[PDB]
């Protein structure tokens, strides 16, 4: 049995790890977190993925408890705007496709169909009407049933870290505010301790590197190799603004991803404000040009509002677990937030760290299994993201022209051939766990315009009546839900 | 739209296809089946896999209806006997493992455990007590709930074909009893029709090859390449006996697979009798030697009983769909019946044929996707079967010594390495659909003796109480079920 964990870094990565370890092992693990008082954590508004409910449940926290304390909002999906036809948008919702007579509604839609997402998903209407996913009495709109409509959240990154540090400290995590200046290694290259400015050497059995892009332990100390995705995903910078929303009722229960001239822009609706960020490649636009284009789009003349500029390290470490060090968060990997995966990567890395937790005999076969899982998680998402750029039909600036001809990860060419003939499915998407399911791959293809040439031929041999009835049910149930549900803001105000 | 299907062959493959097509498309497809009046279909007692319930449900047939008409029995799993030492055994049941605090009962069994199957599965007790999976009132023991304990069947192959021909003919399948003498091809190599002795040319749009090992269309006409698995799975012959049952209550609700001196032997319990078959490699034992060994084991002195000798073609076509011809059943592929997969391959080929049904354009991308799916289906099983021979600890004859050192498929080595350290899971088993789930891979490993060196270290850091309570629940629920359920025979007698 290993006795102690030392976490270096106090961002979302560090505190999620601390909290989860305590929830998992309680007093059967000792945990110390060391974080700098002067190197700032990434603090923007952030979107999450559908698995995030599980993390809070596991911690024993109800959404009514944590969400208001993190300036929280609801994410039913992502609205993708201006990617193909100008002014055309669509939704990528957290909602599974229904199945009629062995075929999902997307197959039926192609045969007997109004946009795809509007026809096939309740969530589409909920978004258009800016509904909350809960009735005022707190009950889920589905009436677990949470899996069928697995909505996620928007929140303030600083606040969630602040809230989790409190959770973790309340449960025995030793907290040290100091800078790590040197990382000690023993005669085998294993980490022996971290040397701080004012608290001496801090030691333990297992070191978790949550130091962000920097990768102080995994890269700077251990020589872990970082594999860049720039060749297939060139976006490398971001500029963000925090914009107050004059209207409450304008609060949208979804993230928006708007294609810009040389990248794309997020809109993440928090409780009293919207975060906006322009993710771009500095090969096609300067940071200054990018700030100007962002400002023009969301806050013209608002020079009172400060712009936050960030460089991104895009890609992943070959191995996120080397010797007795595991990297969690941006130290481990990162891709642009086009599908809100940052916190997903953190949660999964942590869940899997618990599953692959080391005993006193560090098992290299177990560690290698952990490393494969982490590689597949990010590689699957990388491939899914490249699909977004390949699906985008717009070709109006040098950036979009270059996205059209840019090299692809292995396997994506095949998925694009398949997609021109028929829909991807469980057997033909990326086969290893990467968060996303079949409906996500299909929805992006259909929304962006990668559409089968013709419907599935089997369908012509079948009775269309049950599918047509299902489409009618969906439109009907939609109508009813938007009449019964409070607005996104309404519900949130009622739980503050 | 294509209109007409011509099936050549009236074994299980042919009639399953005919029936399923009618159930799927009704009068929106024309189907003709041509079968020889003098080449016999494979007629032994057969075991099935868990998906088979879906096939009968799809046809609209309740088990009370079809099972008695096929001399049917229940299969709750497979009892593996003597794969290591004489008198030792374990079950591979159709039952999913329960999960406690994020870990399945197998992981808990290694940490806090009585054999593995006995500890972890209700089905173990049901098999030992020879229970039926249903109460006399017809209700499932689980109280869908059918997925949690997805039992299958034993039946007579001739009877099921006979029963399905009736189903299909009742629904408009044209039936022709004749020999196909020549298969015609157009200028492009596409099949134009099949020439019979007494009924002239029979034509259609789509040709299904259900001619068995022979592959009259797919191999003899089209020149499809057949990929042999003999290098990794040498068994190439079988000899079978049909043995009447003295005492009805000897009827077991499972298949038995007993390792023999140069292969293994099945016991398949039908309603009035047991089928027994010795599957073997003629490199290590002659067909005469094999018959003697079989006779000695299950029916000594019973020379009234006729032995049925069969050569097996083991492997798969590179492509089961070429031009306008799709191979279904033994014409497509076959592996030894160690895990009862023949009918499973038929059903999945058919289900996927409906999904990939061609339109007038014959989309080559769609066909290619079908071929990949069929290749994976069989390759996954092939790898699982080699695992059985690699896990077998016995080394007492040249056959078993040779099984120990025989070459493996790519990918298995890595799975064996993982297995010595920790349990396989969804990410580390064969990744494409091949019928079997994680619990099957794990259960075979633990049953055969491929056991992690030590329990999962994470477990030592956790409270064992909930798992211990679950084990107790399982033992308790087991006790109750064998007291409440009728015998396998009892229930079957009550529905004849
Ligand atoms: C522009 C942008 C947008 C994003 N949007 C989303 C989104 O919408 N949704 C989502 O899920 N994710 C998003 N992400 C990812 C998200 O920011 C991270 O996943 C998450 O906040 C965790 O970051 P981190 O904890 O790994 O690193 P950081 O927040 O950078 O924390 C690093 C920590 O290490 C400490 N540290 C560094 N060096 C030392 C040292 N020498 N001694 C002691 N301490 C040290 C620092 O003090 C700090 O506490 C986005 C990222 C970027 C860059
Ligand atoms: C020893 C053994 C044990 C098995 N055990 C199991 C088991 O336990 N569970 C399981 O699921 N599967 C098992 N299988 C597989 C099972 O036999 C088949 O999957 C299933 O019965 C279908 O076989 P088939 O229809 O493809 O071929 P066959 O039964 O061989 O049928 C071939 C048909 O083609 C016709 N035909 C051939 N040539 C012509 C021609 N020129 N003109 C007209 N008609 C022609 C024949 O008349 C016949 O009707 C086993 C197989 C073997 C060999
Ligand atoms: Cl992200
Ligand atoms: Cl079989």
Swiss-Prot record, chains A, B:
Site (Important for activity): which residue positions? 339
Could you tell me which SUPFAM superfamilies the record lists for this protein?
Answer: FAD/NAD(P)-binding domain (SSF51905)
**EC number assigned by the record:** 1.14.19.58
A single GO molecular function term of this UniProt record: monooxygenase activity
Listed A to Z, the keywords are: Antibiotic biosynthesis, FAD, Flavoprotein, Nucleotide-binding, Oxidoreductase
Named in its record, the pathway it takes part in is:
Antibiotic biosynthesis
Domains: entry comment: The tryptophan-binding module binds the substrate in such a way as to expose the C5 position to the key lysine and glutamate residues at the site of chlorination.
Q: What is this protein called?
A: Tryptophan 5-halogenase PyrH
What organism is listed for this UniProt entry? Streptomyces rugosporus
**Species lineage, top-down?**
Bacteria, Bacillati, Actinomycetota, Actinomycetes, Kitasatosporales
**Gene, per the UniProt record:** pyrH
């Amino acid at each position: 049995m290993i006795r102690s964990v030392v976490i270096v870094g106090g961002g979302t990565a560090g505190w999620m790890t601390a909290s989860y370890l305590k929830a998992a092992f309680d007093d059967r693990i000792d945990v110390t977190l060391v974080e700098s008082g002067n190197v700032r954590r990434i603090g923007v508004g952030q979107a999450t993925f559908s698995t995030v409910r599980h993390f809070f449940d596991y911690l024993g926290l109800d959404e009514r408890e944590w969400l208001p304390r993190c300036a929280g909002g609801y994410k039913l999906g992502i609205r993708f705007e201006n990617w193909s036809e100008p002014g055309e948008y669509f939704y990528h919702p957290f909602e599974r496709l229904r199945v009629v007579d062995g075929f999902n509604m997307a197959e039926w839609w192609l045969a007997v169909g109004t946009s795809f997402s509007e026809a096939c998903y309740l969530t589409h209407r909920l978004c258009e009407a800016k509904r909350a996913p809960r009735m005022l009495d707190g009950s889920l709109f589905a009436s677990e049933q949470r899996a069928q409509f697995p909505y996620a959240y928007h929140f303030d990154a600083d606040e969630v870290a602040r809230y989790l540090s409190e959770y973790a400290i309340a449960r025995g995590v030793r907290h040290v505010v100091d800078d790590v200046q040197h990382v000690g290694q023993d005669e085998r290259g294993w980490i022996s301790g971290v040397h701080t400015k004012q608290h001496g050497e801090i030691s333990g059995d297992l070191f978790v590197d949550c130091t962000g892009f920097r990768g102080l332990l995994i890269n700077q100390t251990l020589g872990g190799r970082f594999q860049s995705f720039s060749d297939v995903l060139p976006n490398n910078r971001a500029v963000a603004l925090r914009v107050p929303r004059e209207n409450d009722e304008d609060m949208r229960p979804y993230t928006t991803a708007t294609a810009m001239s040389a990248g794309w822009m997020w809109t993440i609706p928090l409780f009293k404000r919207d975060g906006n960020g322009y993710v771009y490649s500095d090969e096609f636009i300067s940071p200054e040009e990018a700030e100007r284009e962002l400002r023009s789009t969301v806050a013209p003349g608002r020079d009172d509002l400060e712009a936050n500029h960030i460089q991104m390290r895009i890609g992943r470490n070959e191995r996120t677990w080397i010797n007795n060090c595991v990297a969690v968060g941006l130290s481990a990997a990162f891709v642009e937030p086009l599908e809100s995966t940052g916190i997903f990567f953190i949660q999964h890395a942590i869940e899997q760290l618990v599953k692959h937790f080391p005993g006193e005999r560090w098992d290299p076969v177990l560690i290698s299994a952990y490393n494969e899982r982490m590689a597949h998680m990010v590689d699957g998402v990388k491939e899914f993201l490249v699909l977004h750029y390949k699906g985008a039909q717009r070709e109006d600036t040098p950036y979009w022209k270059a996205a059209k001809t840019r090299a692809m990860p292995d396997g994506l060419a095949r998925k694009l051939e398949l997609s021109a003939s028929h829909l991807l499915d469980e057997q033909t998407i990326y086969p290893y766990y990467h968060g996303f399911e079949t409906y996500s791959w299909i929805t992006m293809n259909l929304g962006l315009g990668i559409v089968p040439e013709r419907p599935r031929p089997a369908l012509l041999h079948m009775d269309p009546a049950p599918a047509l009835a299902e489409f009618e049910r969906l439109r009907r149930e939609g109508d009813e839900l938007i009449a019964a549900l409070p607005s996104c803001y309404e519900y949130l105000a009622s739980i503050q």
